């Protein structure tokens, strides 16, 4: 009686819906759905995943252990997991128009940050040297980072890192100083990859420095991979030895990562011997058995779906719109008196340098957040500290996914400008000059609270008009 | 164009990607019709999968609840904080003595994050030897190559079984540790059929002033249900995956002591110093944005782990494995350590005159999913002498003791077929075995008959996480 | 002003620096009047000292003979080439099978240079534990601190004595090495009274594919004379100091196999790969200009090592130590391993109720130079329980067997005084012992009488390296 | 057989080892007859050599004065304590602000001991690039190989000269240090002809919180005499050899700040933390028994460094080098940095159309001892484009300004012969140059004539450390 009652009970538990089993979690998800419906989402690393990707990520593919590689597994039962991973690899090469005799791919790395660590582990001995764009100048923690205080990224613990920096007069990477630094530092690997950079890489110049230094050229295209797949910006694959990327962000896939690497002939050396690329086995073995265990086959299957979408004409039109929206956004910001780092943009984001407006990014970000415009404060050339940012970073991928077009991003720039004006009013009313005096005014001044409520209402009414991505408005729990 | 990509983003998987949809339908049928005996596998709940497949995936939330780098994380914070508090409750932990990190992406990086938090590069780790039931994420090197990157960045040395008994040789562990001076000792295994002597590991770690890390990935659901002894009584740090016996999404958790540790010889309080180091190793040290969809599904799985029916499930996992072991022993099989006290068994096939690679090939063809596995005494990790099997996944579908007696019977029938294939093989090589297995009409018929028996038995049990009635492949 | 600084450059030490001249005269008297029993000390020849005190000191000669980075080295090349030739001849080595580096400045950096040549940073070394008779330059760390920098830059693990027998526990060494996987194993000691089983070390090194380094510093002169078995029969690399039983200047040599490997060890390379790596680690890796005054003095010492007189000397060293041990045993002293096969003994004072620190303080006051020394069983390495003594230095002055029986008698009388100071000591601590030792007039008189007995006995023997007749201090 | 080996031990070098005695006599004659221009060479005093060749060599004295690990060291303690006292006095150092270690065996291990004391393995060091005049013990690696072991165990990066001016580019050093974050910066060189901007290095070290290490090996005697500015005004740690301009024995010293460094923001004293770390790195970290004969000779040399005659000598060293540089420039040679402010010059032969290897071969044959040396602009490290020369050694023999004008003339005549050999060489490889140099009778006659000119000039000056009248080889 009790034994069978219990067995029926745990089977019911396993087959019941989330709404029935865990209403508290279901409610949180419904609140997050409403949040994604109502906001101006300008964080340039964020996007809205398709329903079909989410259905694959939420499938029974999660149940399987499949250590190894297709057709070379350690466990049985992997006939269909092998189909998915093989299909994912094939679509990954196709999405970037790569010759499979010249390029291989690993689709098992769990996210962007460990993907880079796996490349370093594959190709570098402990304490060998890496150069990458300095984090406050637009780099990423997974390329290394250390302050005067301590090593922040563990890449800087296990490997020896050194940054390269912007030309702070132009806002572009200072390639001349990168080259001169590399002569002295002797990197074994140079990363060409940025997060908060409004320009595209001079991959040809990085390639020249890497050739002279006999360094691996790693392109980390996480922020731009969807633009690359659509063919609307130049491809790092024209030059790089290894290419890493997140599968989320501009690719618009599940949370995950890919590692691409050259295969085949590198050069015939001076003795007439072929030198072959030595990346495939080293990288595949660093991922497994080196640093990961069982692949996440639900994510790999969702990635295959995302990579199919990436080849379509609709996806190319989407990425074209991302760029055109960002240019219109930049146009409108310039017309309204804002300064852009490097003077403009060539991609999906802008960096606004707020110095000429007489207020910093931390104050503006707080007002934007209260009116449901998501952006983030950003270091700009000229800041005295990497902890007091003078700028704001904003981008177009997420709202473009919901159907914002050029005229809509002109409106986004208008509402951003209205938020900046409120921030300046709060600063003017602030009894003091420190950020705590600013937030005290921002939370007690009823007149300025009312202006922010009004602007928040304007933001939400504009955003709500657009389709929701990945779920239906009609079945949302929270329709106000 | 605008309407064009909106439609693409909101279309079903069936509409957008029929090839992937069909692969998932084939995998559903595989999970329905087979004996899934890999002891690290389970069938997770529909509710977990609905959370993992939700829009929680869209948000970037680097940092920790209430201490994020980006805004817009109010509801992500609700989920992660709920997950953390449910994690401590699932193991009946006092939150003033234990903290938890729920962001680690899987079991292997979770262990690497602990080492990065607490050890400098090239500091010393001891753990169970991989061929004796350990795990790659604790270190492993051969005579010629460092296989796990743990053994590249840290200095590793194994401890071993008593090959006479199949239990860990704690006496030799203690003696080795005196000479090797580990800074951290791992108590955890992938292919060990017995309970750990955590008290003995604690004694060695105290003497060596080493961190005691319990890696409970395989047994975490048994621990949560309170049906085997808990490593939290003894350990400094506990890692676990969330997808094995815990029956959650693919992910991991890191638990650590916090608060007051002891009073020194001078009357001063000494506090634990794990929490900040581990949290910072996970982020910003080694990971970026948390996978909020997985964390949300983990919260769901942790609520399930508190229920009476979940405890009944884990008690059944244990009783099923005991019955499974008893039946295998009665049929003449040798088990490493002679039996089991948990969810798995390790069959040593050497006394039957055949190896694990050959038997596993037959199992695969009759729809029994297991893994060939090294046994103590194997001279090459490429020629495994054993098969590893366990009860979590089929117990989730409702297999009870008499059903696992049947599983042992069908395993034995598969071994008998493998022995016939070996006897008929025109050579001694694995490729000769495979050629016979694929060309011999009589033995192909026997395998087809056993496959039909396995599928007919498995099909009668409920499907977990999807509806049998709507499956594409119902035949 | 220029003729005067040239006068100061050519004047004698007596005229230029009477304070230093007086210090040397006091040290000459100390060497004349004492029982010098530290087994690593000797009295080198006048001819060695005249070469070390020559204008060979003025030359920079980085590189190797005939391959220098500076001009002017025609005669420095003759000296280094002659030194190398005599080094190989001193140990009866085939120059087609053995090479030598004579530039290493002393024993400790010589070993570090071998590790740097053959091991990557953090690779693994095994050697005899320091408290069991090993040496710091083979690695050493305590529970809390890495003491030798060898243990900072490389990963070290000790092997130990069998505490019951006092001999190296080779069985435990072999079992430990299986788990630890050393890349290099050191066979050599500072306070081991028995002969090494070099054949057994070779067997373990072969199984582990580890370099066998013999550090023969203490026994090199015995080896050169052929009176004990040679480590060159087995080792890959042999290091030594030149100032202990070899009786040369302060310095070191590194010997290494070269040429074709044994038939069963030839592979991708058929030749040994030690010579270039070791020579390059010495220079340009870790040293600069060779000390050609020392190298020239070493050439002199190596020629002396070939003579029948030198062989007779080393024979007497062994017979003196055997007699010394027998006399100590008959006077009730416990010896580690119960005796000796070489030039030293290690007295364990446990059966006497007093430690090495107390006894050595009395020895020093009665002009007997020895060292307190850890013994097996000591609970702490700061409180050594033994005294180490040996025969090389006094044998050089002509002490024979009956003279070392007298040395043992006077050692015994010193221990008895130490026991009286302990018995009269109020407190239990070493400060109270020293307080008694410096304030008790009766025991101060007994130490004075014993000091006179030691000095009267030692003064009868020839001085080595200088003449009694020109000593400043003749009383 | 006692009487036989005791006579062996007390006989003179002439009696025991005529071959070695002969080599030393040949080297004496070479030091009499040649132009010794290697700027790291000197001629030390007889009194130093008598101390280095004394019975102080016989003592083991591990530890520090008054803190030895065993007995017999009463007089060795006097010598080391006296040497420390004189070391601080020679550089006018306040003993409450500076300490010193006098046990480091030579300059290269002294620097390695400082790194081991103050830096963990793989921490970062900046120093002057070897091809720009730096030293191997500050680090050196090529694209293919780590040459100095400093670059194996630590992470090194060079700073460079302004190749237009030949002075250190301090602006680039500072900018490089921002990016590289060195933990230690070396201010010292082997072939830099200008004075260091120690104040600028101090400012960079302060901004980077890096240790400022001055390696003053080449200039130490100039510093002691007060004829150039002192690195002790700025540096945290100062290393030096003792055998170059200091004019002492072959050895080294490590100086370090001690005592109060600063008061922190809470009013608490902050002490320097160099002394214990450095002393413990020397022993027990990296060395064993001190070389007390060298330490005793060093004490002698340090007393000699205090005299007015010594100051007059170091002033003459500078004036001689200035005139030497002026004469080389007048004869058409290019100097790196266009001149000198210290004891050496570096000739860049590019404008003469010949490399340093060819020129040094002729110098050697005409008894001018110098070294081929890399210069800025050299494409290959193995094809040095320069010749390094300096004045300490011949100034010690009484050369004055007009004499170094003649040295420059004879160097010029040797270069002219080298150019003739090159012109007569049919091939362009160095072996063809050597073949021409050894077979051309006319050019051999010219080298023989120039050799006779060099010897006739050099022989007129006093010999340092020995008397001409007792030279075995006067012809
Ligand atoms: N118990 C157990 N756990 C496992 O995880 C496992 C695996 C998968 C992980 C694994 C992979 C490669 C090697 C490996 O050894 N690779 C070598 C092969 C050659 C050699 O073994 O010397 C290599 O050089 O790659 C060892 C282990 C195989 N057999 C296993 N058994
Ligand atoms: N056999 C033998 N060989 C030796 O060379 C030796 C020595 C001299 C070298 C030495 C110096 C310090 C420590 C040392 O350990 N220092 C510790 C303090 C002691 C401890 O912690 O146990 C430190 O912290 O410095 C250990 C060894 C003392 N006793 C010895 N015995
Ligand atoms: C103790 C332990 N710790 C960590 C892990 C790694 O988890 P991951 O596969 O999610 O990285 C495992 C996985 N173990 C799997 C894969 O080998 C198994 O089949 O046993 C484990 O057993
Ligand atoms: C085996 C061995 N190898 C190396 C050394 C180091 O020689 P060094 O003192 O010249 O550095 C020693 C010194 N041994 C001295 C100091 O401890 C002794 O009294 O025993 C040694 O015994
Ligand atoms: C600045 C500096 N520091 C250290 C050293 C090393 O001294 P050592 O040769 O005694 O090891 C040198 C040696 N310099 C010698 C050998 O290169 C020379 O001819 O210049 C040095 O120039
Ligand atoms: C976001 C990003 C990453 C890291 O991805 P995560 O999934 O957050 O670990 C790595 N590189 C770049 C350039 C990125 O923008």
CB of B186 within 6 A of ligand 3: the answer is no
Please give all residues whose beta carbon lies within 6 A of any atom in ligand 4, as ranges.
C 40, 106-108, 135, 137, 188, 190, 215, 217-218, 241; D 60, 62, 287-289
Greatest alpha-carbon pair distance for chain D in Å reads 81
Pairwise CB contact (< 8 Å): A75 & B281? no
CA angle C46, C52, C57 (to 5 degrees): 155
List active site positions of B.
Answer: 60, 62, 215, 241, 244, 250
Residue that is written with structure tokens 């030799």 in the block: B172
- Which atom number of ligand 2 is nearest to the Cα of residue C133? 1
Residue A97 sits in which domain range? 60-310
Phi, psi of A249 (to 5 degrees): 60, -140
- CB contact (8 A) between residue B180 and residue C181: no
C422: number of Cβ within 10 Å: 18
- Report the alpha-carbon angle A73-A76-A77, nearest 5: 115
**Which residues of B are documented as binding site for pemetrexed?**
40, 60, 62, 70, 106-108, 135, 190, 218, 289, 388
Ligand 5 neighbourhood includes D188 CB (under 6 angstroms): yes
Longest dimension (CA), chain B: 80
User: Alpha-carbon distance B303 to B84, whole Å?
Assistant: 11
CA B102 to chain centre: 17
If we measure between CA atoms, which residue out of B183, B184, B255, B180 comes closest to residue B217? B255
Nearest to C50 among D12, D135, D360 (CB): D12
CA A302 to CA A92: how far, in whole Å? 12
Question: Which of these is catalytic: D146, D160, D203, D250?
Answer: D250
Nearest alpha-carbon partner for C347 in C103, C137, C37: C37
Task: Work out the number of other CB atoms within 10 angstroms of the CB of residue D242.
Answer: 30
Alpha carbon distance D101, D80 (integer Å): 9
| Elucidation method | X-ray
Q: What is the three-class DSSP state of C165?
A: coil
Report d(CA A92, CA A97) in Å as an integer: 9
Q: Active site residue: C244, C257, C361, C422, which one? A: C244
Q: What is the DSSP code string of A230-291? A: TTSS--GGGT-SEEEEESSGGG---S-EEEEEE-SEEEE-TTS-EEE---HHHHHHIIIIII
Q: Give D30 to chain C, closest Cα distance, Å.
A: 8
**Does D27 contact C56 at a Cβ distance shorter than 8 Å?**
yes
Instruction: Pick the residue from chain C with its C-alpha nearest to B173.
Output: C179
Q: Do C180 and B180 touch (CB under 8 A)?
A: yes
Mutate to test the interface with A, among B8, B14, B20, B240 (most CBs of A within 10 A): B20
Q: Which chains would you list as touching C if contact means 3+ CB atom pairs under 8 Å?
A: B, D
Told to judge if C250 belongs to the known catalytic residues of this protein, a careful annotator would answer yes
Q: Which residues of A are annotated as a binding site for L-serine?
A: 45, 67, 75, 223, 249, 393
The whole-angstrom separation of Cα A460 and Cα C186 is 75
What span, in angstroms and rounded, lies between the C-alpha atoms of B245 and B39?
8
C-alpha span between A186 and C417 (Å, rounded): 67
Q: Is A65 a catalytic residue?
A: yes
Work out whether the CA dihedral C423, C424, C428, C433 comes out positive or negative.
negative
Whether residues B157 and C176 touch (CB distance < 8 A) is answered with: no
Residue C400 CA: distances (Å) to CA of B12, B417, C12, C42, D117: 102, 83, 37, 16, 46
Phi, psi of D356 (to 5 degrees): -70, -30
**Is residue B156 a contact partner of residue B213, using CB atoms and an 8 Å limit?**
no
What is the DSSP secondary structure assignment for residue C351, as one 8-state letter?
Answer: G
What radius of gyration, in Å, describes the C-alpha atoms of chain A? 24
Catalytic residue from among A161, A244, A245, A246: A246
List gaps in chain A by the residue before each (C–N > 2.5 Å): none
Contact C284 D49 (CB under 8 A): no
- Which of B141, B155, B172, B179 to mutate against chain C (most C CBs within 10 Å)? B179
Q: Which of A352, A375, A362 is nearest to A442 (CA)?
A: A362
CA distance C356 to C350: 9
| Cα B261 to averaged position of ligand 3 atoms, centre (Å) | 30
Measured between CA atoms, the residue of chain D closest to residue C302 is D17
* Chain C environment of D369 (Cβ under 8 Å): 70-72
Atom of ligand 1 nearest to the CA of A67: 8
Pairing of strands D184-187, D211-215: parallel
Residue B206 CB burial class (10 angstroms; 0-12, 13-18, ≥19): exposed
How remote is the CA of residue A258 from the centroid of ligand 6, in Å?
A: 11
Which residues of chain D neighbour A160 with C-beta distances below 8 Å?
A: 122, 124, 155
Quick one: three-class SS letters along chain D?
Answer: CHHHHHHHHHCCHHHHCHHHHHHHHHHHHHHHHCEECCCCCCCCCHHHHHHHCCHHHHCCCCEECCEECCCCCHHHHHHHHHHHHHHHHHCCCCCCCEEEECCCCCHHHHHHHHHHHHCCCCCEEEEECHHHCCCHHHCCECCCCECCCHHHHCEEEEECECCCCCCECHHHHHHHHHHHCCCEEEECCCCCCCCCCHHHHHHHHHHHCCEEEEECHHHHHHHHHCCCCCHHHCCCEEEEECCCCCCCCCCEEEEEECCEEEECCCCCEEECCCHHHHHHHHHHHHCCCCCHHHHHHHHHHHHHCCCHHHHHHHHHHHHHHHHHHHHHHHCCCEEHHHCCCCCEEEEEHHHHCCCHHHHHHHHHHCCEECEEECCCCCCCCCCCCEEEEECHHHHHCCCCHHHHHHHHHHHHHHHHHHHHHHHHCCCCCHHHHHHHHHHCHHHHHHHHHHHHHHHHHHHCCCCCCCCHHHCCCCC
Q: Which atom of ligand 5 is nearest to the CA of D106?
A: 10
CA of A279: how far to CAs of A106, A132, A158, A264, D171, in Å? Answer: 11, 20, 20, 10, 39
Burial B41-71 (b: 16+ CB within 10 A, else e): bbbbbbbbbbbbbbbbbbbbbbbbbeebebb
Report d(CA A66, CA A76) in Å as an integer.
Answer: 8
Rounded Cα gap, residues A145 and A141, in angstroms = 6
Is ligand 5 within 6 A of the CB of residue D384?
Answer: no
Residue C98, H or E segment:
strand C98-101
CA distance to partner chain C, nearest, from residue B424 (Å): 40
Tally of CB atoms within 10 A around C461? 16
What is the spatial distance between Cα C376 and Cα C161, in angstroms, rounded to a whole number?
Answer: 8
Contact C73, C59 (CB under 8 A): yes
Contact in structure between B232 and B93 (CB atoms under 8 Å):
yes
CATH code for the domain of B128: 3.40.640.10
Considering CB atoms only, which of A25, A55, A117 is closest to B12?
A: A55
């Amino acid at each position: 009686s009790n034994a069978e009652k219990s067995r029926s009970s745990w089977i019911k538990q396993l087959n019941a819906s989330l709404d029935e089993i865990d209403p508290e979690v279901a409610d949180i998800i419904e609140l997050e759905k409403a949040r994604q419906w109502k906001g101006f989402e300008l964080i340039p690393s964020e996007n809205f995943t398709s329903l079909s990707v989410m259905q694959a990520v939420g499938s029974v593919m999660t149940n399987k252990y499949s250590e190894g590689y297709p057709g070379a597994r350690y466990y049985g039962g992997n006939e269909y997991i092998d189909m998915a991973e093989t299909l994912c690899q094939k679509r990954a090469l196709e999405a970037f128009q790569l010759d499979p005799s010249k390029w291989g791919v690993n689709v098992q790395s769990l996210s962007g940050s460990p993907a880079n660590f796996q490349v370093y582990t594959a190709l570098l001995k402990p304490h060998e040297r890496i150069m990458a764009l300095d984090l406050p100048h637009g780099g990423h923690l997974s390329h290394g980072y250390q302050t005067d205080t301590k090593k922040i990224s563990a890449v800087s613990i296990f490997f020896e890192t050194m940054p390269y920096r912007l030309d702070e007069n132009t806002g572009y990477i200072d390639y001349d100083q990168l080259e001169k630094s590399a002569v002295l530092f002797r990197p074994k690997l140079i990363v060409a990859g940025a997060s908060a950079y409004a320009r595209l890489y001079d991959y040809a110049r990085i390639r020249k420095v890497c050739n002279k230094q006999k360094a691996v050229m790693l392109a980390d295209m996480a922020h731009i991979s969807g633009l690359v797949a659509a063919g609307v910006i130049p491809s790092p694959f024209e030059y790089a030895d290894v290419v890493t990327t997140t599968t989320h962000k501009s690719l618009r896939g599940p949370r995950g990562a890919m590692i691409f690497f050259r295969k085949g002939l590198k050069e015939i050396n001076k003795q007439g011997k072929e030198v072959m690329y030595d990346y495939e086995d080293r990288i595949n073995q660093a991922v497994f058995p080196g640093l990961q265990g069982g692949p996440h086959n639900h994510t790999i299957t969702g990635l295959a779906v995302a990579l199919k979408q990436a080849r379509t004409p609709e996806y190319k039109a989407y990425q074209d719109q991302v760029l055109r929206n960002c240019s219109k956004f930049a146009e409108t910001l310039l017309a309204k008196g804002y300064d852009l780092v490097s003077g403009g943009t060539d991609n999906h984001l802008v960096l606004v340098n707020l110095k000429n407006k007489g207020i910093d990014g931390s104050r503006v970000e707080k007002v934007l957040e209260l009116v449901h415009i998501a952006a983030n404060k950003n270091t700009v050339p000229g800041d005295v500290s990497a902890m007091v940012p003078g700028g704001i970073r904003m981008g177009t991928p997420a709202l473009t996914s919901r159907g914002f077009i050029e005229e809509d991003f002109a409106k986004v720039a208008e509402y951003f400008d209205l938020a900046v004006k409120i921030a300046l009013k709060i600063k003017a009313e602030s009894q003091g000059t420190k950020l705590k005096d600013f937030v005290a005014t921002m939370q007690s001044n009823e007149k300025l609270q009312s202006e922010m409520s009004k602007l928040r209402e304007m933001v939400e009414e504009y955003a709500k008009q657009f389709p929701t991505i990945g779920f239906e408005k009609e079945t949302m729990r929270y329709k106000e």
